[PDB]
Amino acid sequence: KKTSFGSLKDEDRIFTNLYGRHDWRLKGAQSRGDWYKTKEILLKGPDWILGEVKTSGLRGRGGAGFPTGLKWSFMNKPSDGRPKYLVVNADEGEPGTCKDREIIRHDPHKLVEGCLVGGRAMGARAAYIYIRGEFYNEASNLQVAIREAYEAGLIGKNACGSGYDFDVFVVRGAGAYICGEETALIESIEGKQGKPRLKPPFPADVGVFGCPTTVANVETVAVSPTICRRGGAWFASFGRERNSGTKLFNISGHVNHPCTVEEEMSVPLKELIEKHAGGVIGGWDNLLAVIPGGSSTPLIPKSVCETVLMDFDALVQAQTGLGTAAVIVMDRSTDIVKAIARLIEFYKHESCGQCTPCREGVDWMNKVMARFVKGDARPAEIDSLWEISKQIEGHTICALGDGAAWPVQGLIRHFRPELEERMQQFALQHQ
Amino acid sequence: DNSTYRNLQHHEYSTYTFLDLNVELSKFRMPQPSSGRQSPRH
Amino acid sequence: GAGGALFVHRDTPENNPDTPFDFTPENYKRIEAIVKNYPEGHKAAAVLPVLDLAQRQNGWLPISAMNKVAEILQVPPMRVYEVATFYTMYNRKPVGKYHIQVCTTTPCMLRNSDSILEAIQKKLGIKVGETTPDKLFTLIEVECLGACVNAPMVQINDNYYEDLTPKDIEEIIDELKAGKIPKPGPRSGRFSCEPAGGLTSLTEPPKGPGFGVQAGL
Amino acid sequence: SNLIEVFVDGQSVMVEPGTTVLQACEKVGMQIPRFCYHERLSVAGNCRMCLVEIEKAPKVVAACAMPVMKGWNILTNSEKSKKAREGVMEFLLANHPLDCPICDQGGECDLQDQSMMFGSDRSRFLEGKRAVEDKNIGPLVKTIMTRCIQCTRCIRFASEIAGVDDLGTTGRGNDMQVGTYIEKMFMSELSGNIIDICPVGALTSKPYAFTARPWETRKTESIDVMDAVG
């Protein structure tokens, strides 16, 4: 019914300690409404919690956008003999993305309570939080909050006046972007290299230690208990249909005030930038391009950025995708080819090397891109490069290959004249 | 109220803080499940 | 682009299987807690933390440390070698006292992250991949560190230094040289990634317990 | 009984539950291209050479690892599967060394034959190739690792069949290399078999080096007498 989105009231945000201006420990969290009626939520049953998540319309906050109630119900099968586990994906490897770091270091008890609520919903015996290895102080804050939760009886033995036993473990990575991929994360937890495994089987059947497992993003887990407390309908009231809720947004690059903010789902990109990030450096006319959802998503130019909304469906219709909602803006005083080439070099340095298309083709893309920045190539190759990206996407084990193919495709599609002009200028300069 | 930043506790975290917290928490855990064997190589 | 670090080990007077490495008793206590974290029958899952612990005790990972971890956890040594060579936070070569990592990925590069790189080079008189003669600093370039909003930034020994200018990085370096530790976080007094002068959210006092609870709960 | 019905290029076949697309195609007489899959090894799914199209499914599946489902129609000779094969062979050949005249696997190479049968006939790779240093694993298996295609057949054989955990992968991405990471001889009573399972000239027989070509040889089927196994 509502048509205009983007005015989120202060009392309506989920992460009310996003900026760390309040006590991140247990006392402040209870003061702000955390660990309230948690026993009632646990005693209401797993089916009720799953239904609340389903009518909430919550989609996966890792970036894929899969309906979360559907996965958590996939886990809802009867017992087999193996223990059941919840895995929280706190790897946060995507360039431009820092939201999980802020919700982990400043509001850890929301994450812990979400772990408990989700584990109760899916019948898990424990939760493993795979925190990025570089987030050492954030991991220590998480461990201190978990210590407080154990001391207060909120988790562990009986966890409440509930009768449900639940442990929360924190495990640290060691410098691997690929270990954010859920199967690669499970492999890393088991002590092997961070190489993704093929699907099927899905983690709900065979996961960590060979047991049923659900991997969920930090934001999804951390918002689940508030959804249970306030209701699925309250969460579903925000955003368009199939795009419900409030999403954390990271604004970085050529803005006056780069920042992380929580805002309604279907906000316009221009509105978000001009309201929370202070505008693009040099005014809106100075905008050249935006990567709206992290490095994996293709970039879009100013013409489409003018009137585009920030959600999965609208950004898919703009041929990009919402991704992780990491807006990276670039004005007309930057080298767009150089920026895309740097992203491709990042992907070359982050591939695990397991499958030949990603390994070989991403290395090849990196080499071609470096030449492109110089302009050392010829016009005929651009099409060649486009074909190479197509070969990679849809043929690899995991989606890192797609995430390396898409930025190249976006750059070609929206800035072929710039590549052609650079090649022509190089040819003129070198004779 | 909001003017003060209240996450300075990580300013005195040492090289062993995480592992020491893990050791402290080791007494609060539930007994682990077992696969039945000492190792997959057993 | 090209890495520059080899992934084969050749024996060496200061790096060989007889290089003396052992865990301290309290590190053995930490190891036993770490192993207790995982289900019985799956002890290889402790390879990543325990190996990390060895580095925290030693500063880097000799081949003897890898063998010691493999024999403590009763896993084949080749598995520990694969783990050590896969993850980039493990130092298979000795490193300086202050490992300086500069993020140069696109969001950080947009906000002038090479100026801070060259400032560090000029201050230390070393190139990107080397170590100072006194074995006190080691420059290196890394990918996105998860603080893109506070760009440009560096990481030194578990600490994040954010919102940097070349003057700020010079003061951080000479404060490290003095002997004391500079405080982590962003510079310019921005306090963990809010708008610099905007303050466009979370201004009203947060609501208390049970503010918007539904009926029947 | 419990058999399910699937289709290979429209032809019906009944298979046991859990049967892979590759095995269903085998039951019809079609051999799917492969590099990393082996019948007696565990499934890997690395080389992506077995990618095949399922009717009315937008994404290709890895035939060696994906169990077939009831009603599926596998399109082995479809345009999408042919293009997938061509792309995977292009990626495999991008960094491969031009070693065929000096490679001992010249006339009996699965890489060569599958390139002629399923790949393109030309290259559009205009860069320099990677080169890795050779490892020494004993006087029986000669190692030239620039020819390696990272199928991990040798690692799986050594771990599962031979019961020796000496082989692994070190590194990441493009410079991930198969080896031991230390100077170590791979010695076992079954060590020479990794020469046969290696699809390329990366692992060869050292005493056999440069003596013959596979098309010259005459084959006599006989019995070993070095023990009582026969």
Place this chain on the structure above:
Amino acid sequence: RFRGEHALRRYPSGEERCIACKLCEAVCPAQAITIEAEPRADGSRRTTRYDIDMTKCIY
């Protein structure tokens, strides 16, 4: 382009070009080439026998 008496060539360093791939032996329509090879004392891939029967050769 004239085809006359056969010859074996070498690099400017004096090292012989033949590396015993046996492609010429495989392609010879008259089966006039006989080749035997082994590793050299320096590990090089070289021939120990390279015979051409000129009364079988069709040039």
Place this chain on the structure above:
Amino acid sequence: WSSTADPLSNLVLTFSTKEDAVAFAEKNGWSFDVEERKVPKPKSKSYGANFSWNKRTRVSTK
């Protein structure tokens, strides 16, 4: 060179079935030995067994 004196050293014949080869050999007066065809037995392959909760099929690397 390698010299031979038997004219049938390079003679190899192709047949659709074993019965055809037996008929040809019998009508041509040659004593024969027939070996039955060896066929690879069907194998049970499961990618999920690579990551096993409690079996020995769990792999240490992939």
